[PDB]
Amino acid sequence: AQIPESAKAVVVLSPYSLQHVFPREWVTKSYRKTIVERPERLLASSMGISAAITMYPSLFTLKSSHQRKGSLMAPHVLKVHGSSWPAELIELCQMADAKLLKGEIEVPDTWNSGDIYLSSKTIKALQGTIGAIETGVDSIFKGPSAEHISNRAFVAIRPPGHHCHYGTPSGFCLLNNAHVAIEYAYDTYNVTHVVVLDFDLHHGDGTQDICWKRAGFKPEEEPEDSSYDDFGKKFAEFPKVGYFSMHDINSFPTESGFATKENIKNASTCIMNSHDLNIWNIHLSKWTTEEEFNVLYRTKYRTLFAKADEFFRSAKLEMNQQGRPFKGLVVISAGFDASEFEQTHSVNVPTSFYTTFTKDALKLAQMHCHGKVLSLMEGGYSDKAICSGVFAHLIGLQNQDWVKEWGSEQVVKEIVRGCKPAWKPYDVIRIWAEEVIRLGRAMIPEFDDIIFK
Amino acid sequence: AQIPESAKAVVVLSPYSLQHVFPREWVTKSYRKTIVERPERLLASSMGISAAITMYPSLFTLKSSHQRKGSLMAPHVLKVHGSSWPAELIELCQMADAKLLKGEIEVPDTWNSGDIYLSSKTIKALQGTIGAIETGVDSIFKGPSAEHISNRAFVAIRPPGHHCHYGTPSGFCLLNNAHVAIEYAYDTYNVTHVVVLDFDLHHGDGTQDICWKRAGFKPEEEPEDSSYDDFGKKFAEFPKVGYFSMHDINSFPTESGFATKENIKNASTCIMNSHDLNIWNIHLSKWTTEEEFNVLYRTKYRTLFAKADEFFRSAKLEMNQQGRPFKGLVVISAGFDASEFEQTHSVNVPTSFYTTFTKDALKLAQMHCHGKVLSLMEGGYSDKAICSGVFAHLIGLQNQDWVKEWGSEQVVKEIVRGCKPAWKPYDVIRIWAEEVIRLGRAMIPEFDDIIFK
Ligand SMILES: [Zn+2]
Ligand SMILES: [Zn+2]
Questions:
Q1: Strands B270-274 and B240-247
Q2: Ligand 2 mean position to B205 CA, how many Å?
Q3: Which domains does chain B have, with CATH numbers?
Q4: Which of A80, A198, A330, A445 is placed for a possible disulfide with A365 were both Cys, Cβ 3.0 to 4.6 Å?
Q5: A256 CA to chain B: closest CA distance, Å?
Q6: C-alpha A360 to ligand 1 mean position (Å)
């Protein structure tokens, strides 16, 4: 060829993730549309993937995890979540169907049944999602020949992870995908230091909660143990994780009017290199003009990369002063619900932001991680936000330039037509869009069983 | 004259604050020197005051609160602390002496007896401190003729306030001086919006805790009430307070190795204009050269003024959109324990920082508060740190330039000689220093009863 395979970014498809679906068949079909975390999100993410590959056919490699599974008992789950939550999750799923045919809510009465659901199919879905995560990590670390190994991967998985706490699910998240990826990468490839860059509209309170666990502080779920000193702390183990988020402080999990002291505090935490914590949270600002947003980016949002840069410089020093091998990774919590295209707080981001942000993540990974970048899909709910966001994210993951018209309402509207389950075709923008739609709808054959029929 | 009295900054002396003294007479005289919060701090603060007045005899006015008292039942205490803590404080003081002559600790067994003390004399001391605070506020707001009213005051009070929570004392603080000043200024002069700028080495966890109370969130001390919604929130009332701190995140109340999740979170909180909160916490950085510290100041510490500027601009908008009168105040929590001269974590500040910081506070108050600035003494414990810090702080409070040699080890060492209770005199620096010492030792006559004898 000309472009070598190692120079391409890997896109990991997760066919088992399609199986997790809202199950309560006795609700209004209008309430049913209120449920935004659904299998159709993967069809929209495939449209974004298709768009990137159509613009740049030589820059991406599609990889399906197919039937590869990870165990809910695997060490990269147990060491992230303990053994009590995984076993309770499996129990709930195994009793769900029986409850659900009696018109009963399938989750515990202490949970917000409106923001979390499960069924017996959820187990296979999560096992497959773990498989797809392992595939992503393997794609960028595995092999005898470092030169023949890709550096960047995007993993199109659901349900999302960043709201799942150490021992408690919430916000449609049953498992913290990012910390599972991190633990697998540490166990399998000796990755020692990871930064998580989270540009979802929502605070990743679950990802951050588990950062506190990794610092050695006792989780709220766990019964107090003599393992912890009088301050509820013990030794912080590898891998070391730094969490860097930009999000709307007036949205979930701290929606204006519906917010607790404790969640407001976590969503506002800024601390580096102290008490075994590395956590930085920044809040989205309103803007109107293109130049207003650029000022916000250059003066406010870009500082996430500065803090993450400090994290890696400090880590290299501690490792070399101690005679230990350093190995970094940049993880992106790629959520697209802050997009201008997300369904209707006026703090949004323009579609181009996803290209810009990802390009700056590339610079960070080149300087400290030998270019290793792992992006995992998080939130993002309308067809338009997911499709346009994945598209610009992938364009930036391969260090290409965004063209403003690529994210125009006209173009995104034509692509999204292909998400309707019974889409039939019908001028330049239409011809290109139907080329994108044909590939996107074919990309996972299971779309047909789960959606088109 | 030439310089009008209104152009001078007011220095408020608090003779009753001398009476609060560590009382447990059965300890080692070495342990006794471990107790840093002591009446002698006011003698050192008088040396700094004396130094500023000797350099600039026309720029300051000394004012003693003399025997003016505020009540521990006054509204500007009850509305800051509730009625339960004030009454419990008075009870403890009234039972202390009887306990103390039996060799008993006078505070409750659930408190850290090592970081908090009281005696029967503490009540009069606190009443007088409140009186001195009222004097400071009155000095810059009271009178028929706005043109004939000073804009700036420094209040030399102890014990400090910034560690006192809503309902719980700690860190040698029995009363939150800053929020008492704020409430008095709101009750008496209709001050609606206050920024607190805190450059003490330690996080002002008490001042910040009370900011949460003012936002309408339930304090941990208070029993849950139907006054609060399901999120523990109710309506936020005037005055609106914003808290802006730079401090060492590895020092008390979050000392490295001895720190709780909850205190680490509060000491790292950054949030503006949301959930009725305005809180910004920044962490001191190590430096070695003069130019290293200047970079830290210009790129990290100065942002406190930017955030406080945003606070006032937002406040003016909300008030004018609602037809309400805005009136601002800048309060400085002036603690000097971050000084290079404080007794031995290597994050320090050069003496000149206190001039620079205060000058930037002047600019903020000129733009938004008609120049109104109220500085209240907080921490700072060695004779050298308090004397040099107050000196440079006062030099900056009157917008003068610091001269590096003014804070040289030679000069500060000569002044501090005058703090020894039996000081006798003995060349240019010595002559100037003894002029400073004579005035400083005479400034409060009660020094003689409490210290010199
Ligand atoms: Zn989300
Ligand atoms: Zn202090």
A1: unpaired
A2: 10
A3: 5-451 (3.40.800.20)
A4: A330
A5: 6
A6: 22
